[PDB]
Amino acid sequence: MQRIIGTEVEYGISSPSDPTANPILTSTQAVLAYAAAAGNMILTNGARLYVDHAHPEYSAPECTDPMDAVIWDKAGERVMEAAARHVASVPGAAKLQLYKNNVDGKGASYGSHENYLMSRQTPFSAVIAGLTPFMVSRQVVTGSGRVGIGPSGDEPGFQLSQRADYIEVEVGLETTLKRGIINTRDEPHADADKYRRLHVIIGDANLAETSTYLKLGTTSLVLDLIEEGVDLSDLALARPVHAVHVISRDPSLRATVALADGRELTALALQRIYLDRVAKLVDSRDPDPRASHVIETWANVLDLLERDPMECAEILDWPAKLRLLEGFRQRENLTWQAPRLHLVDLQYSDVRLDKGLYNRLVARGSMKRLVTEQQVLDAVENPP
C-alpha cells in the first residue's frame, strides 16, 4: 500500500531529584546532548528532534508502509534513551528520565500525533462522517491503558485510553485544549491543490509494535475506504464524544454506544464492520501483500479480544499493562487508588531498556515483536 504516513511524539520528561526543575530547560538540554553526541535538529534518518510545549518531540520521517512507520517510531524511542544516557554521562548532571506516554495523572496531557496524506478533492465532511466512528472505536485495539478515571483521575479504575478524558469536541482545530475526535488543521507542506494532510491527535503513544502497526495500517485503509466513496453513513454515532468515554472506561469490551440509527454496538462490532468493508475493498483491487497482512493482523486481534482480552497480553499495550496491574492488585490486595498501580502504569512507558516495564516484558519474551532490534537500530541512523 502507498499512503504517506508520519508520526510526531512528545515525550514526558522528569528529573526525580529536582522537584523545581524547569521542563523547558531539561528538554532543551536533552535535545542538545543528543545533537552534541551525534555532532530544531535534523537527525541522520530525516526525523526532527526539537523542543515543543516543554517536551522533547521526535518527528519520524514520512513512510508509506506502516511497518516502516512503526520501525522509525521505535527508533525515536531509542533516540530518547540515547539522549538521556548522554545527559547522564556528564559528571555532576542531574538524572533525566523520559516516558513515552501522554498524561501525568494530574491534569496535563501531551500528545502523539499521526499525519496521513489524502486527496484534496475528497470532501472533509465525508472524512468527518466516515472516520468518526472508526476513531472512536479503534482504542479497543490501540488503547495504551491508564490508571485513574477523569481528567484529574479522582475516580478509581482502569481505562483503555490515556487521551480519552481530554477529548471534548467532535471536530476542532486546537491541539492544546478542547481537543477533538477529528482535527481540522490544514497545512499540506505540498501541492494544496491535490493533496491534503489529515492530522490525528486522539491516539495514545504505543509501545507494543502490533498496537502501533494496527493504529497506522487500519487508519490508512479506512481512509482508502473514504476516498473511494464507499458508504459509511450507516455507522454514524449519536454522541461521539460521549462514546469515547464510554468505550474507554470498559476494559471488558462489552459496553455499547448508540448509533444515530438507534442501533447499539460495541467497539469490537464497529471494528469488525470496518474490517469487513476494508477487506471487500482490498479484495476488489490488485494484490497488495502489506494490506492483506494488515487485514490479517487486524482480524486476528479482533478475534482474540472477543475471545478474551488477556489473550492479547503479549500482543497489545493495554492488555499487557492490565495483566501487570491485575497481578499486583491480586498479590497485594490493592485498590485502584494504590500508588504502586500508578507507578506500574507510569513506568510501563519508561524508555530505559533495563527499567521500562514494557522493555522488560520484551526482554523476557512476554511481548510479541513484528520487527527486529537490528531494523530499529539501523533506522536510528538511516533514512527509510
Binding site: 449519536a238 454522541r239 460521549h242 448508540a258 440509527d261 438507534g262 447499539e264
Partner: protein, 261 residues
C-alpha cells in the same frame, strides 16, 4: 386551524389551536382513551366526531404517540381522510432544536421531548418539567436548552394491593384529598397515601435534582413547571412547583409543526 394529537399509553389528548407563533392558542380540546390496537378507520370515526365542522377548516396536523402502532395508524388515517392537510408526525428521539444529552437519543419518548421544548420556549432558562400522566415524568432542561434526562415514576394512584384486597362489596377508591395525613378509615388512609405521598414523591425528586445536579441549585434561577391531567389535584400539596401549564404538550406540538414548516 392546527389539529394536535398527543397519544400516551392510557389516554390521548386532541386539540385545535388557532394563531401562529406567540399568538397560537388552544381553542378546543378533548381527552379520550388510547386503544393500542385501534385501526385507522375507527380512529378516523372518532376524530371526525370530535372536531365536527372544524374538519373542513384544518390547515395542518401534528401528532406524537408513546404507542408505536397507534402512530402508524394515525399516519394511515391522516393520509386517507385528510389528504390535503400537511402533517408532522413525531417519533422518539426527534430533532426539534433541543439537544438530547442521554445514552441513546432514539429511546427518548416524544412526549418528554415536546414538553421540554415547550417549557424552554416559554421560560428560556433552566427548567424542571413534571408531567402527571399514567407515569410521572420529571425531565430536566439546562439553561442552554439541552435535555439532560430525568426520572420516570409510577403515576398518582392508590395502592393497587390495598384496592384489590378491599373486595367489591366496598375497582379502586376515589382519588381525592382527605381531611388529614393521618387517616381514620381505610378510604382516608389510601387517599392520604396517594395524594400526600405522591406530592412527597414529586417534591423529593425535584429537591434531589436541585441539590445534586449542577446548575439547578436553590441559588440558580430554575423554572419548575407542571402539566398533565392529575396535576391540579396535587398542586396545592406541592411546595417545589411554581407553574402549571395545562397545554404544555399541545404548544410543544405546535412549535414542532411550525419549525418543520
Amino acid at each position: 386551524m392546527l389539529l394536535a394529537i398527543d397519544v400516551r399509553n392510557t389516554h390521548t389528548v386532541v386539540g385545535l389551536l388557532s394563531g401562529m407563533k406567540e399568538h397560537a392558542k388552544v381553542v378546543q380540546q378533548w381527552r379520550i382513551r388510547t386503544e393500542s390496537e385501534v385501526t385507522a378507520d375507527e380512529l378516523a370515526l372518532t376524530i371526525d366526531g370530535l372536531i365536527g365542522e372544524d374538519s373542513e377548516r384544518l390547515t395542518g396536523t401534528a401528532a406524537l404517540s408513546t404507542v408505536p402502532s397507534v402512530l402508524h395508524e394515525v399516519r394511515i388515517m391522516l393520509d386517507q381522510y385528510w389528504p390535503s392537510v400537511p402533517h408532522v408526525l413525531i417519533e422518539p428521539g426527534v430533532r426539534t432544536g433541543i439537544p438530547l444529552l442521554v445514552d441513546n437519543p432514539k429511546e427518548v419518548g416524544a412526549d418528554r421531548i415536546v414538553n421540554c421544548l415547550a417549557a424552554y420556549d416559554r421560560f428560556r432558562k433552566a427548567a424542571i418539567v413534571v408531567d402527571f400522566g399514567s407515569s410521572i415524568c420529571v425531565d430536566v432542561v439546562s439553561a442552554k436548552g439541552e435535555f439532560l434526562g430525568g426520572a420516570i415514576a409510577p403515576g398518582v394512584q392508590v395502592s393497587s394491593d390495598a384496592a384489590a384486597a378491599r373486595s367489591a362489596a366496598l375497582r379502586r377508591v376515589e382519588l381525592a384529598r382527605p381531611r388529614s395525613v393521618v387517616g381514620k378509615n381505610t378510604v382516608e388512609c389510601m387517599q392520604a397515601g396517594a395524594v400526600f405521598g405522591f406530592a412527597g414523591l414529586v417534591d423529593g425528586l425535584v429537591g434531589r435534582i436541585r441539590e445534586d445536579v449542577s446548575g439547578f441549585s436553590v441559588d440558580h434561577d430554575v423554572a419548575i413547571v407542571a402539566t398533565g391531567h392529575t396535576a391540579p389535584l396535587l398542586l396545592p400539596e406541592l411546595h417545589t412547583v411554581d407553574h402549571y401549564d395545562q397545554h404544555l404538550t399541545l404548544q410543544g406540538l405546535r412549535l414542532v409543526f411550525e419549525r418543520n414548516l
